[PDB]
Amino acid sequence: SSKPRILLMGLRRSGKNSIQKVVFHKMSPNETLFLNSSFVNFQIWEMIFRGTGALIYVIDAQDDYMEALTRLHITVSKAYKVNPDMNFEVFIHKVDGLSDDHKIETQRDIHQRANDDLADAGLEKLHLSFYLTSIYDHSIFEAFSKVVQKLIPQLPTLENLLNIFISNSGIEKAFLFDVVSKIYIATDSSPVDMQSYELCCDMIDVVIDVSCIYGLKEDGSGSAYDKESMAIIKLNNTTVLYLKEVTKFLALVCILREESFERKGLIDYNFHCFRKAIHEVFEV
Amino acid sequence: TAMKKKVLLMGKSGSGKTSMRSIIFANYIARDTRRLGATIDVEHSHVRFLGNLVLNLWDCGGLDTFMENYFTSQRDNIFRNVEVLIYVFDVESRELEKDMHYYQSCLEAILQNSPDAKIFCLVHKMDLVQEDQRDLIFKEREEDLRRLSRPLECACFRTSIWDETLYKAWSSIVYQLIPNVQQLEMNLRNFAQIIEADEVLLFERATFLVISHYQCKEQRDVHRFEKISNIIKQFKLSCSKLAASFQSMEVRNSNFAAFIDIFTSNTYVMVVMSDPSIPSAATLINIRNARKHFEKLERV
Ligand SMILES: Nc1nc2c(ncn2[C@@H]2O[C@H](COP(=O)(O)OP(=O)(O)OP(=O)(O)O)[C@@H](O)[C@H]2O)c(=O)[nH]1
Numbered sequence: 042s043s044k045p046r047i048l049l050m051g052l053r054r055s056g057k058n059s060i061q062k063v064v065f066h067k068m069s070p071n072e073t074l075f076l077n078s079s080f081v082n083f084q085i086w087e088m089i090f091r092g093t094g095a096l097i098y099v100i101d102a103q104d105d106y107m108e109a110l111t112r113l114h115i116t117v118s119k120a121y122k123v124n125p126d127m128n129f130e131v132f133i134h135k136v137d138g139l140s141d142d143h144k145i146e147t148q149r150d151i152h153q154r155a156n157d158d159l160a161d162a163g164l165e166k167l168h169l170s171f172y173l174t175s176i177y178d179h180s181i182f183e184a185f186s187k188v189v190q191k192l193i194p195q196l197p198t199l200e201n202l203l204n205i206f207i208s209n210s211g212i213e214k215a216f217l218f219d220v221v222s223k224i225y226i227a228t229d230s231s232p233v234d235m236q237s238y239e240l241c242c243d244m245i246d247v248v249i250d251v252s253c254i255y256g257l258k259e260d261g262s263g264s265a266y267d268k269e270s271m272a273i274i275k276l277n278n279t280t281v282l283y284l285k286e287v288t289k290f291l292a293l294v295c296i297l298r299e300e301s302f303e304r305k306g307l308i309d310y311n312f313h314c315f316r317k318a319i320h321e322v323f324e325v
Numbered sequence: 326t327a328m329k330k331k332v333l334l335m336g337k338s339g340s341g342k343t344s345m346r347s348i349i350f351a352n353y354i355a356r357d358t359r360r361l362g363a364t365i366d367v368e369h370s371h372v373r374f375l376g377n378l379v380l381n382l383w384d385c386g387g388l389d390t391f392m393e394n395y396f397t398s399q400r401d402n403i404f405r406n407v408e409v410l411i412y413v414f415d416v417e418s419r420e421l422e423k424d425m426h427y428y429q430s431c432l433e434a435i436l437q438n439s440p441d442a443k444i445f446c447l448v449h450k451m452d453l454v455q456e457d458q459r460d461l462i463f464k465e466r467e468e469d470l471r472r473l474s475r476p477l478e479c480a481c482f483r484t485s486i487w488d489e490t491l492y493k494a495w496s497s498i499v500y501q502l503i504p505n506v507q508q509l510e511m512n513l514r515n516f517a518q519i520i521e522a523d524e525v526l527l528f529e530r531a532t533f534l535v536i537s538h539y540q541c542k543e544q545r546d547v548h549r550f551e552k553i554s555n556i557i558k559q560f561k562l563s564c565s566k567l568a569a570s571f572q573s574m575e576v577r578n579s580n581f582a583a584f585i586d587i588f589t590s591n592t593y594v595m596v597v598m599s600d601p602s603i604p605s606a607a608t609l610i611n612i613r614n615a616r617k618h619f620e621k622l623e624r625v
């Protein structure tokens with residue numbers, strides 16, 4: 042029940058419903074043209090700003106943003122008054138319709154004025170972070186992963202547990218994922234290749250979608266993801282992807298070589314120490 | 326000495342013929358089809374499917390000007406030797422009557438030149454209609470298409486590049502063109518029963534079209550074959566782009582296990598199990614061994 046709390050905001054047609062649909066109700070981007078199950082407590086949108094961790098203001102960059110930029114300044118100016126520990130996030134959204142010249146121009150511009158408008162009100166000590174997002178890209182997932190990692194006080198502990206696990210288990214990279222959202226709340230200390238994240242997100246999709254079709258039990262339904270959810274994917278360059286259930290919200294996805302995976306037994310035994318430790322972290 | 330089979334892909338400009346062909350046979354994603362140029366006259370494609378079948382795909386530009394040549398100076402070249410006509414319709418067309426007039430004029434040429442052609446009608450871009458309207462609008466378009474198809478039979482599907490309905494339709498089309506397809510089905514029902522699987526799907530390797538299946542206990546999702554095609558095809562494209570080629574997958578729940586692996590040089594297999602007293606080794610040894618017994622068949 043003590044999840045991180047995020048509020049999405051933005052003018053109509055900015056793309057809020059489209060972001061919500063794609064990330065948290067696991068639905069395709071194209072079908073958003075007609076519109077309790079995650080580690081994250083998220084809501085579209087002064088008691089509300091009291092107990093929230095982060096506000097994501099969205100902007101349509103296929104559209105003029107002058108009006109957009111002004112509600113932004115006012116919306117954040119308000120929130121800061123009530124709770125100045127809140128983090129302020131800005132989804133320069135719909136950049137899949139631009140060319141790269143126009144994306145960089147637009148970001149330089151929105152970043153410039155947004156930060157100018159904050160100087161004028163003497164709100165010096167109010168950080169804005171910016172992001173280029175798209176329901177048609179993985180940018181929305183990376184942006185949410187970055188937003189959520191800021192609200193987990195236990196992240197140093199999580200990064201350390203993954204480091205001990207992978208270093209002792211022959212593993213190149215580990216991602217602690219929120220399964221519905223495909224957001225990563227932690228990874229080991231090795232640098233993150235966003236192509237690696239993206240492939241791991243696409244693995245979660247195949248595992249969950251194949252699970253939703255098979256083994257739901259003989260009645261209409263049980264649950265696709267349970268304590269025995271596991272997958273092994275072999276790629277022709279001898280890469281192995283390995284997903285194991287950690288909690289009802291958390292799956293572990295591991296990248297390693299067939300050569301380390303020869304030692305699955307050790308991986309499997311160390312995994313159960315890592316899983317218990319993660320249970321202790323979150324008093325589950 | 327592989328069966329060569331002529332497929333006319335026809336319909337008006339922008340209806341989405343080249344998009345379909347590009348997603349099924351050429352590893353495009355829906356988003357990429359935005360960048361396709363109008364086809365000029367016919368774009369010829371040779372698809373090696375399983376080594377016993379070759380698909381001679383005729384992608385015909387549907388510019389009025391191109392159509393008129395097909396109906397006259399190119400009439401014999403186009404409409405002779407046709408196994409299949411796949412005719413595409415834009416659900417969103419403003420020219421329904423003009424659309425039907427170009428369809429019926431193709432049906433005539435097909436009646437006069439290749440009158441045993443299997444005819445398919447694809448009611449396409451269904452993603453542009455509201456969900457609660459799609460079944461309604463397709464049934465009506467279907468009813469008209471079957472009636473206006475005169476003495477010829479037609480099989481209709483509602484398709485979109487943005488979901489699994491496109492694999493439903495192209496699976497059905499290709500299924501009817503695989504030579505000894507009834508044999509394949511028996512050989513796989515055999516294999517399935519020996520290995521005591523709830524379900525086995527067999528896929529052509531490059532397209533991930535379902536080419537055979539076998540189910541034990543009747544399942545609830547009758548659309549699940551196209552969904553699996555789509556889910557796996559997508560993931561196979563994320564692999565090659567982001568890392569390297571998909572080889573194999575093992576997935577499990579407290580209620581099931583599935584195994585997706587290369588089968589023959591030209592196929593993938595998926596095996597669904599609900600964990601009786603089956604040591605995982607027994608199943609993998611069966612998959613491994615049954616290869617040689619399917620590795621024959623598609624010779625020439
Ligand atoms: N919404 C939607 N757009 C689609 C669909 N299929 C194709 N399109 C788009 O329609 C446009 C035209 O598609 P093409 O495949 O070039 O059309 P074509 O029928 O080959 O046209 P010609 O070569 O002139 O005969 C492209 O932008 C496609 O992305 C679909 O199912 N839904």
Ligand SMILES: Nc1nc2c(ncn2[C@@H]2O[C@H](COP(=O)(O)OP(=O)(O)O)[C@@H](O)[C@H]2O)c(=O)[nH]1
Pocket residue numbers: 051052053054055056057058059060073074076134135136137138174175176177
């Ligand atoms: N091209 C593109 N369109 C988007 C994106 N996000 C949303 N949209 C579209 O823009 C509109 C915005 O939808 P909506 O979520 O209702 O904005 P909201 O009114 O704040 O809920 C819809 O047509 C969506 O298809 C995006 O990243 N790219």
Ligand SMILES: [Mg+2]
Pocket residue numbers: 342343344362363364384386
């Ligand atoms: Mg074309």
